[PDB]
Amino acid sequence: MNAIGNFLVGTPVFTIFIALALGYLLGKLKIGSFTLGATVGVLIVALLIGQLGVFPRDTCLGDIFFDFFMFAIGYRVGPSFISSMKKFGAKIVYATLIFLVSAFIVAYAAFKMFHIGPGIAAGIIAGGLTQSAVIGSSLETISKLPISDHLKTLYSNQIPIVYTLTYVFGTIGVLIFLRDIMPKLMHIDLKKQAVKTAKELDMIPVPVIVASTHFYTINDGSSLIGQTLGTVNTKFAKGLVAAGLNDSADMASVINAGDVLAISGGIDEIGRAVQEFNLLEVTGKTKAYVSKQVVLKKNFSADVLKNAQDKGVLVATLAGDVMDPAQFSTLKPAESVTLVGQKDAVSEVQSQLGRLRAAENIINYSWFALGIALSAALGIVGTKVSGVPIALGGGTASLIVGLVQSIYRDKHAHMDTIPDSLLEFFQSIGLNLFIATVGLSAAKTFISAIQSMGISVLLIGAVISILPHIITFVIAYYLMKMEPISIIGAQTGADTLSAALNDVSERVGSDASPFFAAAVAPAYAIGNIFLTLMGPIFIVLLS
Amino acid sequence: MNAIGNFLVGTPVFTIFIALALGYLLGKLKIGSFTLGATVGVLIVALLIGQLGVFPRDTCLGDIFFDFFMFAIGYRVGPSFISSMKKFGAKIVYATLIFLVSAFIVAYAAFKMFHIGPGIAAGIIAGGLTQSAVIGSSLETISKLPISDHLKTLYSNQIPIVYTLTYVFGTIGVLIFLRDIMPKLMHIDLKKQAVKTAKELDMIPVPVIVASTHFYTINDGSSLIGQTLGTVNTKFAKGLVAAGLNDSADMASVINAGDVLAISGGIDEIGRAVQEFNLLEVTGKTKAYVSKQVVLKKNFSADVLKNAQDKGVLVATLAGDVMDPAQFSTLKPAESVTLVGQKDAVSEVQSQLGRLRAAENIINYSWFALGIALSAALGIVGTKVSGVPIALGGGTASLIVGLVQSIYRDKHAHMDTIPDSLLEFFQSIGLNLFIATVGLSAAKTFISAIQSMGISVLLIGAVISILPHIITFVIAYYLMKMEPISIIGAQTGADTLSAALNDVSERVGSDASPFFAAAVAPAYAIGNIFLTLMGPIFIVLLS
């Protein structure tokens, strides 16, 4: 099997993209009502592939794709972050500070009970709590510690092996617990509860009757013949604007036989007018009638918005449904109205109302590249506390950069934005590629550590990974009376388990995935910082 | 400036994603009617950034993104490749074999005239003809050559520097020549000529009147009252099918007052029926009426397709427009019909006609990963000819894999496909990232080679890069009577200038970009192979 092993180690792209192809197929497997999922299928396939030969750890593609994934989450959760935090931010910050202290207490108790060594303790924590930087901080701390050189070398060798052994369960077992067992224990369905919580806020509006233009043709003998376009437009009720005879929007032309009288507005109102006047619909071939999206200026005038109907343009909300005239005064700057009608009339009221909103299909390459560059530059930033180095790291820096960038783009919508399909693809493939890389990097060491310290360390790692979640769940749900989706998001952020984000978001759906990411984000930063600090203090205490 | 240089070299992601952000902004600059373009803006910004400090060449991200770009082109050009090759494939293969021999003749003549050394000759060819593997093949050949060790070392040192000096002009000047000067010299507009050539084939159909369902409400006193749904459906002309009273598709129910009579078909025909019966349109809230896309089976029955109208389902082409019944017999297997109507009736005729077609919005992660893995595995393949190693390489292997994968998916459409927006994003960012990486890798050597062999080598490289294009253009347009877009594509493929693909495709537009890529692809492979072989023979001849 030396040929297969040599080929797989020689070509890294082939291995990481053949573990990402069979991994998804394995993830699509459904047993009963339980689906393995893409992340678990990739972490299972990558280990078996990595048993074939030795694979060095690749920090060149995996880290960049993880940065892309974190930026995708931060950009997708941008607009709703403030609204989510105003409702549930202090509860989440009080649940992130309970999981961490509970994990500290449980780990200390188990380590004291089972006389666990310092290196094994730091490896177990780094694996079960799914924090990789713990191994580096522990290496630095054990280097500083005044111990014998042989003991320091022994601990520094023990740390990576225990981390690799425990990390396998700390990604599958914890994810299964907080994704399948947890909703059942809380007597709720993940999808249903997330959708209901998102409906409690203004996230998922009902589908609205879009207001469009129909090119009706006037037949001879109609009562509309002999009357001006302005007269007919005034005679029409709200939600029915005459956009102009033929291709002209002038208000003084008379309706002679053989002319097209384009009518814009809602479907039911247009149908009532059609039944009233016995008009005949014709699929008119004209490119002079359009719907534009206008971002209101800082001092948008109410008079022009009110008189756009008189000018011949239908004003509607961004969704597409026509809005009541009384809503005109309630409108505020930075809100995006939609003007539907003739080109000449829509290009003037837009000129007096604000500026055109950029469509979602166009991709802002400069925006995306600047976001990635700033994410890297911010992840560089760090500082040392009590001789222990900490930093924002790729995850936190990318999350913050995505948040601020999406908030700025939402505030000023005249610039283009990265499409949601692209963001979803990056969110999916970025985390899965990182999981594949780490699984391929650590499979032989895992099977070797099955033989030595095989059972005790694995079981203690499972206990330290599972028990804090249980106690924090009991405290939050039975005493702190949270909502289930917030509990799950706060725990996922506190544990710093990025693998759970993709799976829980895909089970929730795109409707409340922004809510889940918003719940995760504040927990993620505090969990990252405290878990990074968790290793060195444990080493100092135990040894 | 040592702090800035150290930070830029230390963080590679920051540098390559800050040269990709300012690069696009510089590319958006428009002077007169000439736009620099994304690729030239990135190659200009990256050189200035690379002058700050020394940057090692990164073959880890750039090569993978180039593979992604080539796969994106190969997948986008998949379905139309055979149709394009049947019309213009031999002309393209006869223009790829003229550019290469012309370049050989011109390079040999210039090298003999100016007593050009072997290493400088191989570097000039590798730079002007934009083929990087030439430097490696030349290094191997000069290693084999029985020359003095000092002379061999001198040539091996000279090759990279001359390549770096000449490569700057061989990417900007040639692109400008074949993108701006060439259309003007051919008295055609690139966009207009490409659109006309694509219209000559069946690529861009005119927008078609989509056939949909309107939920009309029967009012009291209507002539439709007292008649069965089947009777009304039979009384309706072609293109007007009664999809069922209320939410039931049964053919025997009578039309009582207060019922919704959903009518499916074309807008103008529905409007004529509305004028005939004075029906009132209502935005009915029902999810039981849908349009599905059915891929016909190998033995699709004509009887069921003919009687779908009687059953209550409108059959239409994949575009959306209703089709004539006489077209039913002309339909063939693997063609995708569209069935519009009630859920119960559409889920049965589909069951007897074939299988549902997968929507474009869904992304096939397994398909994409398998494509990338097979591209890498095929790029591994190679062989040696006359002691000179050649291989398919990333470009050719990825192009072939994308072609065959897209053709297979088009043949069997029941499986999902990678979205076109994602393919476009990869095609854009993949090449630009590679350009940024190579420009950052070679800027100090470029400015240094400005001082030594600054003018003569640069001018000879420009001549060898430009003149073969001119003579092959004259031969093709004035004697071989080609079309302009085919000439441009064949030359771009023969020169193996992947940087021109993105810019010419973006100027052409998405309408005929598949035609341009199809014209490029066969030229690309032969150009790659012959340019790879071009170096060693020149070294052997000159020295």
Q: Give the helix/strand (H/E) hosting B6.
A: helix B2-10
> In this structure, are residues B112 and B508 in contact, taking their beta carbons and an 8 Å threshold?
no
> In this structure, are residues B166 and B457 in contact, taking their beta carbons and an 8 Å threshold?
yes
The span from the CA of A160 to the CA of A477, in Å, is 36
Mark yes or no for CB contact B67/A13 under 8 Å. Answer: yes
The DSSP secondary-structure symbol of B228 reads: B
Give B361's contacts in chain A (Cβ within 8 Å).
Answer: 421
Give A272's contacts in chain B (Cβ within 8 Å).
Answer: 280
Closest chain B residue to A366, measured at CA: B21
Mark yes or no for CB contact B365/A272 under 8 Å. Answer: no
Tally Cβ neighbours within 10 Å of residue B228: 16
Selected residue of A4, A8, A14 to mutate for chain B interface (largest B Cβ count, 10 A): A14
Tally Cβ neighbours within 10 Å of residue A33: 6
Cβ-based neighbours of B503, under 8 Å, separated by 6 or more:
B37, B38, B39, B40, B175, B179
Q: Give the helix/strand (H/E) hosting B245.
A: strand B240-245
Q: Apex CA B473: angle with CA B468 and CA B475, to 5°?
A: 100
The span from the CA of A19 to the CA of A40, in Å, is 12
Collapsed DSSP state (helix, strand, coil) of residue B313: strand
Nearest CA among B213, B122, B162, B199 for reference residue B445: B162
Region for residue B16 given its phi and psi (left: phi exceeds 0; alpha: psi -120 to 50; beta: otherwise): alpha
Mark yes or no for CB contact A13/B270 under 8 Å. Answer: no
Structure tokens, B443: 């800027």
Mark yes or no for CB contact B365/A429 under 8 Å. Answer: yes
Nearest CA among A93, A81, A83, A89 for reference residue A403: A81
How many residues belong to chain A?
Answer: 543
Selected residue of A4, A49, A208, A366 to mutate for chain B interface (largest B Cβ count, 10 A): A366
- Compare CB distances from B14 to A25, A219, A373 and report the shortest one's residue: A373
Mark yes or no for CB contact B283/A275 under 8 Å. Answer: no
Selected residue of B6, B275, B418 to mutate for chain A interface (largest A Cβ count, 10 A): B275
> In this structure, are residues B262 and B214 in contact, taking their beta carbons and an 8 Å threshold?
yes
The span from the CA of A270 to the CA of A262, in Å, is 11
Q: Give the helix/strand (H/E) hosting B242.
A: strand B240-245
Q: How far is CA B192 from CA A15, B81, B165, B195, B503, in A?
A: 45, 21, 36, 5, 16
The DSSP secondary-structure symbol of A476 reads: I
The span from the CA of A100 to the CA of A469, in Å, is 10
Mark yes or no for CB contact B272/A280 under 8 Å. Answer: yes
Nearest CA among B211, B160, B262, B159 for reference residue B539: B159
> In this structure, are residues B351 and B319 in contact, taking their beta carbons and an 8 Å threshold?
no
Tally Cβ neighbours within 10 Å of residue A224: 21
Closest chain A residue to B15, measured at CA: A373
- Compare CB distances from B428 to A67, A365, A419 and report the shortest one's residue: A365
> In this structure, are residues B304 and B360 in contact, taking their beta carbons and an 8 Å threshold?
no
The span from the CA of A484 to the CA of A191, in Å, is 11
The span from the CA of B522 to the CA of B514, in Å, is 13
Closest chain B residue to A270, measured at CA: B281
Mark yes or no for CB contact A24/B280 under 8 Å. Answer: no
Q: What is the DSSP string of B30-87?
A: EETTEE--HHHHHHHHHHHHHTSS-----TTTHHHHHHHHHHHHHHHTTTTHHHHHHH
Listed in order, strand segments (DSSP E) in A277-377 are 280-281, 289-296, 313-316, 336-342, 354-356
The span from the CA of A200 to the CA of B418, in Å, is 35
Mark yes or no for CB contact A275/B275 under 8 Å. Answer: no
The span from the CA of B97 to the CA of B106, in Å, is 14
> In this structure, are residues B242 and B233 in contact, taking their beta carbons and an 8 Å threshold?
yes
> In this structure, are residues B295 and B357 in contact, taking their beta carbons and an 8 Å threshold?
yes
The span from the CA of B98 to the CA of B105, in Å, is 11
Three-state SS for A29-73 is CEECCEECCHHHHHHHHHHHHHCCCCCCCCCCCHHHHHHHHHHHH
Mark yes or no for CB contact B280/A278 under 8 Å. Answer: no
Nearest CA among B216, B285, B254 for reference residue A275: B216
Nearest CA among A150, A113, A133, A145 for reference residue A535: A133
- Compare CB distances from B376 to A14, A21, A268 and report the shortest one's residue: A14
Mark yes or no for CB contact B377/A14 under 8 Å. Answer: yes
Closest chain A residue to B371, measured at CA: A17
Three-state SS for B328-369 is HHHCCCCCEEEEEEEHHHHHHHHHHHEEECCCCCCCCHHHHH
Distance from CA of B53 to the nearest CA of A (A): 18
Cβ-based neighbours of B496, under 8 Å, separated by 6 or more:
B129, B130, B131, B395, B524, B527, B528, B531
Give A14's contacts in chain B (Cβ within 8 Å).
Answer: 373, 376-377, 380
Closest chain B residue to A283, measured at CA: B268
Mark yes or no for CB contact B419/A419 under 8 Å. Answer: no
What is the amino acid identity at position A428?
S
> In this structure, are residues B112 and B486 in contact, taking their beta carbons and an 8 Å threshold?
no
Q: How far is CA A302 from CA A87, A265, A328, A349, A352, in A?
A: 32, 20, 6, 11, 11
Give A274's contacts in chain B (Cβ within 8 Å).
Answer: 274, 280-281
- Compare CB distances from B21 to A267, A282, A369 and report the shortest one's residue: A369
Distance from CA of B312 to the nearest CA of A (A): 24
Give A421's contacts in chain B (Cβ within 8 Å).
Answer: 361, 363, 419, 421-422
The span from the CA of B207 to the CA of B267, in Å, is 14
Residue with tokens 């693998």: A499
Distance from CA of B227 to the nearest CA of A (A): 21
Q: Give the helix/strand (H/E) hosting B162.
A: helix B149-176
Distance from CA of B177 to the nearest CA of A (A): 26
Distance from CA of A30 to the nearest CA of B (A): 17
Mark yes or no for CB contact B21/A209 under 8 Å. Answer: no
CA dihedral A273, A279, A281, A287 (to 10 degrees): -80
Distance from CA of B20 to the nearest CA of A (A): 6
- Compare CB distances from A61 to B64, B266, B432 and report the shortest one's residue: B64
Q: How far is CA A448 from CA A388, A435, A452, in A?
A: 31, 20, 7
Tally Cβ neighbours within 10 Å of residue A110: 17
What is the amino acid identity at position A154?
L
Give A268's contacts in chain B (Cβ within 8 Å).
Answer: 281-283
Phi, psi of A335 (to 5 degrees): -90, 140
Closest chain A residue to B368, measured at CA: A21
Q: Apex CA B176: angle with CA B515 and CA B428, to 5°?
A: 55
- Compare CB distances from A372 to B13, B271, B422 and report the shortest one's residue: B13
How many residues belong to chain B?
Answer: 543
Tally Cβ neighbours within 10 Å of residue B60: 17
Mark yes or no for CB contact B14/A376 under 8 Å. Answer: yes
Phi, psi of B388 (to 5 degrees): -110, 120
Selected residue of B67, B268, B276, B281 to mutate for chain A interface (largest A Cβ count, 10 A): B281
- Compare CB distances from A274 to B11, B267, B274 and report the shortest one's residue: B274
- Way it was determined: cryo-EM
Give A275's contacts in chain B (Cβ within 8 Å).
Answer: 219, 278-281
Tell me whether residue A5 is exposed, middle or buried, using C-beta atoms within 10 angstroms of its C-beta: 0 to 12, 13 to 18, 19 or more.
middle
Mark yes or no for CB contact B372/A275 under 8 Å. Answer: no
Mark yes or no for CB contact B365/A428 under 8 Å. Answer: yes
Q: Return contacts of A6-11, CB within 8 angstroms, 24+ apart.
A: A6/A53, A7/B380, A8/A49, A8/A52, A8/A53, A8/A55, A9/A53, A9/A54, A9/A55, A9/A56, A11/B376, A11/B377, A11/B380
Mark yes or no for CB contact A18/B370 under 8 Å. Answer: yes
Tally Cβ neighbours within 10 Å of residue B442: 23
| Letter string b/e over residues B122-151, b meaning 16 or more CB atoms within 10 A of that residue's CB | bbbbbbbbbbebbbebbbbbbeeeeeeeee
- Compare CB distances from A21 to B274, B366, B425 and report the shortest one's residue: B366
Structure tokens, B283: 């935005």
Distance from CA of A332 to the nearest CA of B (A): 30
Three-state SS for A176-210 is HHHHHHHHHHCCCCHHHHHHHHHHHCCCCCCCCCC
Closest chain A residue to B272, measured at CA: A280
- Compare CB distances from B419 to A268, A272, A421 and report the shortest one's residue: A421
Mark yes or no for CB contact A21/B373 under 8 Å. Answer: yes
Mark yes or no for CB contact A280/B275 under 8 Å. Answer: yes
Mark yes or no for CB contact B428/A61 under 8 Å. Answer: no
Tally Cβ neighbours within 10 Å of residue B293: 18
Q: Return contacts of A228-235, CB within 8 angstroms, 24+ apart.
A: A228/A252, A228/A253, A228/A254, A228/A255, A229/A253, A229/A254, A229/A255, A229/A261, A232/A261, A233/A309, A233/A310, A233/A312
Phi, psi of B417 (to 5 degrees): -135, 160
The span from the CA of A354 to the CA of A345, in Å, is 14
